[PDB]
Amino acid sequence: LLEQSGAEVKKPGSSVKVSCKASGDTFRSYVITWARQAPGQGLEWMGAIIPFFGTTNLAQKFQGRVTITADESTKTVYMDLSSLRSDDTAVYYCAKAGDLSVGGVLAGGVPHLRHFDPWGQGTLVTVSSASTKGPSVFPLAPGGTAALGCLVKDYFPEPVTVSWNSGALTSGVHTFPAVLQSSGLYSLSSVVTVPSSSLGTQTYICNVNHKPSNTKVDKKVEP
Amino acid sequence: ELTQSPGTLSLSPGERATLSCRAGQTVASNSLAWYQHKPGQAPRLLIYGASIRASGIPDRFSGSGSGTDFTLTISRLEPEDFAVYYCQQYGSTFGQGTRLEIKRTVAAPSVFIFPPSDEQLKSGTASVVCLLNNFYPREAKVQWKVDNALQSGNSQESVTEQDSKDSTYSLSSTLTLSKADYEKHKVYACEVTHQGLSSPVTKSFNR
Amino acid sequence: HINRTALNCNDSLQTGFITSLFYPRPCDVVSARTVCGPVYCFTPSPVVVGTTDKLGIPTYNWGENETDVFMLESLRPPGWFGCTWMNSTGFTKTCGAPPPTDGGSGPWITPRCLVDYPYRLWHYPCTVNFTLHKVRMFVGIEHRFDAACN
Ligand SMILES: *[C@@H]1O[C@H](CO)[C@@H](O[C@@H]2O[C@H](CO)[C@@H](O)[C@H](O)[C@H]2NC(C)=O)[C@H](O)[C@H]1NC(C)=O
Questions:
Q1: CA Rg value for chain C
Q2: What is the CB neighbour count within 10 angstroms for residue A165?
Q3: Where do the domains of chain B lie?
Q4: Number of domains chain A is built from
Q5: Are A138 and A96 within one domain?
């Protein structure tokens, strides 16, 4: 089992430092890898570390920009990137490449890579200049069926979770992936399909949740 | 140096998904893996080494390949097997994963368009929202028309993830314009040109 | 200074012989392309040879290069001599004069006694049940080491 750190929002200039809590007892001989994926592009391998010997060797792309270190006092391996960009705004996972004791690795100091059976939960890190802002929530009101939505606008920190009707209504609801405006504040809308004749039957209310800004809102939705 | 193909795959449950993973320079077949990644979850290990199934991996998944070329295969396509599949070499490099999709019959888009509300007009910014609901396949085109005139550069299009229950996407387009320009144009239309549609649908509303 | 331990270990069979660290051929130069962990020589007592260069220079490379070597000639007494290490495959190796009263190859001062050292048990597993006595003897210089005897 590999635990990870919390979602961190940092300015592009500054560095990020995300941990990885490791379960097993042979921590000295664990070889641990960090690697990430871009919202558009595929996976790519950054590098792997050895805690007892403190030896890493990394891909050609991040050889200079990233530094990996580990402290075995606490069963955690750390991950640090200097001068972030928007190119590096992505999701960062932790994987156990292998155990040195039975790995059959450690050739020429540099560690080789083995399959990563356990994988960390992942740590998103939003790298933008724009400062944390709360989401505005407007109503999208309106044979066939009906459609009524909730629009959640102008929020910089993302994770955004929308609920409907005290989280008591689950069927045919959609809440889109965030879109990033040129301003650098995300936006998304939570639509649902009901019966074409449930519209005047029952009150609809969307329940938006914004963790990083500590905001929360109930908004009636009627024409 | 890993070349996957195809980019996307779309098959119906009970079909045989076959996906290649190639190398420019030959790999020792020792060090090559496959992974099943689900959004909001952590990537899962399916094959470790060569033609070996990891633990907690149903019999349907099957590794193969030696030398430069490699293949994952599934004979029984169950309905959770439709995540993105990365392959990887150790030593280490990945490929751009393949997307495994749910073949369904064409379903046209239920289409709805919403007015920007008064609570948003009094705030100075206006935004219309068109809605393609419970349709398949994903590819679509929502052209905006304001005052019978074709808008460009103002829109954005977020598309949802493939539905697990009924295997239909939903798309929403969002036109964003100043209030001043909003108050100055009448005919706020939205045009859907989907493959399930004989003529293009257009729902609209007048300010 | 720990950068002078040669670390080339090809355990392609998954034996696990590297756990200990984490927890008739005469002595000569041995290229460190084939060394897994410490290289101990026993002049009359244990010494920790590190990855050197051919002219004696200590290289802080973990033994990565083709011309990183260990130097076992250079520690011989002007006497009895032996060294040991773990090559990459995990097989223990030995260098020393051929043998009765005469000492063994690598760490066997006696046919039945061994110079106890920090990686003795890793290099020689069968020696666990051997109990230890303390010894202090001149052979121009005064040495102090421990004996692990059959
Ligand atoms: C480690 O040393 C062992 C022997 O001490 C090497 O294995 C020997 O290999 C030669 C030729 O390949 C054979 O003739 C011997 O019979 C082998 N000895 C044993 C005991 O099996 C081994 O190759 C060395 N490791 C490496 C990586 O070179």
A1: 15
A2: 15
A3: 1-104, 105-207
A4: 2
A5: no
Question: Any idea what the CATH number is for the domain that residue A159 is in?
Answer: 2.60.40.10
Burial of B152 (0-12, 13-18, 19+ CB in 10 A): exposed
Pairing of strands A30-37, A90-99: antiparallel
C115 Cα: distance to centroid of ligand 1 (angstroms): 25
Q: Which residues of C touch A (CB under 8 A)?
A: 2, 7-16, 18-19, 21-23, 61-64, 88
Q: What is the dihedral of CA A19, A20, A21, A25, to 10 degrees?
A: -130
Q: Name subunits touching C (3+ CB pairs < 8 A).
A: A
8 A C-beta contact, residue B88 and residue B33: yes
**H/E element, C22:** helix C19-22
User: Are A193 and A145 contacting, i.e. CB atoms less than 8 angstroms apart?
Assistant: yes
Q: Which fold has domain B105-207?
A: Immunoglobulin-like (2.60.40)
Chain B residue closest in CA terms to A113: B91
Common-topology check for domains B1-104 and B105-207: yes
| Chain B residues touching residue A147 (CB < 8 angstroms) | 110, 112, 114, 131, 133
In the reported structure, the alpha carbon of residue C90 is separated from the centroid of ligand 1 by a whole-number distance in angstroms of 10
User: Domain residue spans in chain C?
Assistant: 1-150
Written as six digits, the tokens of B16 are: 């045989």
**Technique of determination:** X-ray
Q: Which residue range is the domain that position A68 belongs to? A: 1-129
Resolution as reported, in Å = 3.2
CB contact under 8 A, C11 and A102: yes
Give the residues across from A209 on adjacent strands: A161, A216
Residue C127 is classified by DSSP as: G
For the residues of A161-203, what is the DSSP string, one character each?
Answer: EEEETTTT--TTEEEPPPEE-TTS-EEEEEEEEEETTSTTTS-
